[PDB]
């Protein structure tokens, strides 16, 4: 891991190897690659918190692959989830 | 033998010491003045002193425990008479208490091994069922022989009544009025939902407790516990349960209105050093938002606010709202969300919400009924959770009308009422409010009317004593100033270390000021001077006649903004612990309100 | 296998133990293989198992092995499948007085000695309750001198025990029960061996009494107390503050 991480800019090969489900496109793969790792949170002595973890939002016409790579990510992460709204869902996205 | 172990145990009572001071000896001497009939214990303290009890209390605990109880009672009996001989019949067994921190093992990694041993663990609470009772000493008379007897039971709150003392079987009545009992409850538990498999529902477990180990806990309180994996009753099977022998709670998880009110004495002296500085106000303004830039005038209101104001009652009941109400208003950036994130931290017992109510959160009292007996109970409220506190809101824009109404009533009387079918409520809110805005497409509102954000043009300039356009129009250097103010946060900790060296100087950290706030919030007895009366009646009539013209020009004013500075001035003087007031801060008063009238123009 | 070794090594209470655990194993095996042998509670199922396994190997012993309704049934079923002293002239057994001696949890060797005494000299009697009473009393006073030497609360509890185990309110007869056997059993080499073992000699040591009685003043009548006594009594008043 360290050998390859330090040797000459892995990240092109990250987005080359993220999700070959669709050939698709590199940009949103890169966005969600940032979404994968999570950053670093901190607090200024326990106040003025900063969020280390990353968010994303995609959108566009349904004709293209929108509900594929996220389930792939569910298959690929650690402690991921594929929840959903109503219908074909694990849980209702709340607590109760 | 057993008495060897009893002495190996009882020497630990009075012949143990650390940091050159007796610990448990005088602990008991105190507990007996408390009339407590119990103690506290650590078991870490027993490992070095002695190894003749640990490895056997481990695997045969119930065999060893009531021994300790009796040893304790033995120590009690001497010291009772000795202290009666010193100064100034019925002494039961003392519940023992203990704790530990050696480890925590989860419910998942259990098995049917190490059963009846003692285990350590984590989890989350649900149950507060009922005070179910048991017996400890109960007298018996026979119905024919009239043959009195007696029974007492010890731990298991093994045998039954006597089958024969002709009287036949079951000859015995249980007398109550000379019998004795104790309480327990049935307490549940379930694991951390964050440390679970992706798929399945969770597994819970029951437990039982006794006299003074009762009623310590209320749900949601994450707690660690140690107990004995006991048993009671497919093909042939018995139910697994646990017997408590140690509980430890976080001191105070979710904020309890029944909080601490009797502070220590050492803190008074630094409190009053901070009472008597002239720099009080300026320090608080330098420190409420140390990683935050400008808007000094905005940060200069919060201190007027958190300290409340003139709780004043009159012989009809028309109280005046002791606190004040506020409304930020402006754009992205400009720290309108970050302070609100912060304020709960500095806060002792207040609450935060989004709008519409949050997930499973009634923005007011969302009453419903009982899972059992189908009965009525007042459940919740984001406006009554925080009784005697502030409330923080973001996205005030998208209210529901029914949601907006009661909150719209609180900020002028702070008392909700619900009178649905059977239940009739008057539940006291008694809270302060922090708002937050969503300007439609941002900045052009200053070019436009006061409003033209949302369709409450009424309540804005009516129910609010602090309303501010919160922006600067992209000065090319303020950007760089705030950027370099803030970039040092993320590493180098120079913004943090400056607060370190300034608290070493004249600043205060989070909790010292928290306690200062709590203390003055409940201590002071403010008032204002007759001399200070006219100073602002003049200001009032002048601002009235002034904007009469400029608002008659075809471009709000209230008795409430008149009545508001009445209480803000008292707050800023309150900071100095001021049972009176002078112009010293009345000048700052309109110095800070003028921002509101400037906004009132535009 | 635990329970097997348990019940098998319950017989005492070289090739024997081995062959008998093997026997019970393959016996239980044969008995449970077929569908022929059922409604046999495992409560009791390793006993005439053990008795016939005694019958098999080489030597068998009718006594002390079976030690009842279904005992016979299952046997055939498997075997096909394959006051006290006014009472004049009473009678006793080995295990009757093993009980009356084992009530004090005394060892079995002393009991066997009283048994030998009996079965040789139970011939010319009037009442053996007296003889065995006195016997086991003078076993207790000789072996239990330590606890009594430090606890004189014992001598009342013990005599009360044997006063009502044999159902009397009068007791001086028991006093006679002791001194007469002591007159009788006074001088046998085994009695001698016990007195050198547990060291009463009227309840007092040798190296003391000989100077008590030869003619001395160095004789230590311990009116005074020993040093360790005070060394430990001091702790009681150390914490006198409380
Ligand atoms: N570029 C692509 N290559 C292969 N399959 C695709 C591609 N784009 C879309 N699809 C198929 O069409 C579907 C698009 O579904 P999607 O738009 O995610 O449904 P929804 O909009 O309801 O989530 C996918 O399930 C995918 O299999
Ligand atoms: N006035 C300010 N000075 C320094 N940093 C700020 C200021 N306002 C916002 N930030 C920073 O920008 C980020 C955005 O938060 P914020 O602007 O409060 O939310 P919103 O933009 O939704 O109102 C935060 O991480 C915060 O630290
Ligand atoms: Zn009766």
Swiss-Prot record, chain A:
Compartment annotation: Nucleus
Further remarks about this protein from its record: Present with 1690 molecules/cell in log phase SD medium.
Gene name, Swiss-Prot/TrEMBL: MCM2
Name of the protein in question: DNA replication licensing factor MCM2
Disulfide links within the chain: none
Subunit and interaction comment: Component of the MCM2-7 complex. The complex forms a toroidal hexameric ring with the proposed subunit order MCM2-MCM6-MCM4-MCM7-MCM3-MCM5; loaded onto DNA, forms a head-head double hexamer.
Similarity comment text for this entry: Belongs to the MCM family.
Function, as annotated: Acts as a component of the MCM2-7 complex (MCM complex) which is the putative replicative helicase essential for 'once per cell cycle' DNA replication initiation and elongation in eukaryotic cells. The active ATPase sites in the MCM2-7 ring are formed through the interaction surfaces of two neighboring subunits such that a critical structure of a conserved arginine finger motif is provided in trans relative to the ATP-binding site of the Walker A box of the adjacent subunit.
Binding residue positions for ATP: 60-67
Transmembrane segments annotated in the record for this chain: none
From Swiss-Prot, chain B:
Subcellular location: Nucleus
Gene3D superfamilies in UniProt: 2.20.28.10, mini-chromosome maintenance (MCM) complex, chain A, domain 1, Nucleic acid-binding proteins, P-loop containing nucleotide triphosphate hydrolases
Catalytic activity, reaction form: ATP + H2O = ADP + phosphate + H(+)
One Pfam family cited in the UniProt record for this chain: MCM_lid
Record InterPro entries: MCM, MCM5, MCM5_C, MCM_CS, MCM_dom, MCM_lid, MCM_N, MCM_OB
Residues binding ATP: 330-337
Keyword Nucleotide-binding: yes
Residue numbers covered by motif Arginine finger: 462-465
The EC number(s) this enzyme carries: 3.6.4.12
The protein's assembly and partners: Component of the MCM2-7 complex. The complex forms a toroidal hexameric ring with the proposed subunit order MCM2-MCM6-MCM4-MCM7-MCM3-MCM5; loaded onto DNA, forms a head-head double hexamer. Interacts with CSM1.
Family that this chain belongs to: Belongs to the MCM family.
The protein's name: Minichromosome maintenance protein 5
Organism expressing this protein natively: Saccharomyces cerevisiae (strain ATCC 204508 / S288c) (Baker's yeast)
Organism phylogeny: Eukaryota, Fungi, Dikarya, Ascomycota, Saccharomycotina
From Swiss-Prot, chain C:
Domain of life of the source: Eukaryota
GO MF, any single term: DNA replication origin binding
CDD domains, per database record: ORC6_CTD, Orc6_mid
Iron among keywords: no
Keywords: DNA replication, DNA-binding, Nucleus, Phosphoprotein
Cell location: Nucleus
Chief localization: nucleus
Miscellaneous notes: Present with 2970 molecules/cell in log phase SD medium.
Functional summary from the UniProt entry: Component of the origin recognition complex (ORC) that binds origins of replication. It has a role in both chromosomal replication and mating type transcriptional silencing. Binds to the ARS consensus sequence (ACS) of origins of replication.
Family to which this protein belongs: Belongs to the ORC6 family.
Protein's name in the database: Origin recognition complex subunit 6
Native source species: Saccharomyces cerevisiae (strain ATCC 204508 / S288c)
